[PDB]
Structure 1
Amino acid sequence: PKMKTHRGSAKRFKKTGSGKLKRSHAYTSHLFANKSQKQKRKLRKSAVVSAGDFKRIKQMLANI
């Protein structure tokens, strides 16, 4: 039988074009009275999964 996709890692990573992985930033769910304004513009963007952890979970979501 053919492979699954590791579902929780599919609802959180839009696979970009040209072979990279997009993610969102953390620390952004609920608690906001103690992080200043400057972090908040830094953490509503997206980012890329780094070269270290990409080696680990590239198998989980190689089915787009």
Structure 2
Amino acid sequence: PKMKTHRGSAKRFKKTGSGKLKRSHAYTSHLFANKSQKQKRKLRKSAVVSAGDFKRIKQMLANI
């Protein structure tokens, strides 16, 4: 049958123009008292999925 998308991943990740995966940062839910403004400013921005992880998860988002 058709390969199923990993739906959890489809809600976290997004494919860029060159085929990288855009992601949000962790540590962006709560406990902002315990993180510096510099940390919070940087965690606010988007990031890329790393090479090692992309290898592991690439096929889970194949249909996207």
Q: Name the TM-score, length of structure 1 as normaliser.
A: 0.95
CA RMSD of the aligned region, Å? Answer: 0.7
Kindly indicate which of the two structures has a greater share of residues assigned to helix: 2
Please, which runs of 5 or more residues in structure 1 have no aligned partner? none
Aligned residues with identical type, % of pairs: 100
Q: How many residues align?
A: 64
Q: Where in structure 2 are there 5+ consecutive unaligned residues? A: none
Structure 1: 4+ residue segments shifted above 3 A: none
- CA displacement, residues 3-57 of structure 1 (integer Å, 9 cap, x when unaligned): 1000000000011111110000000101111111110110110000001111000
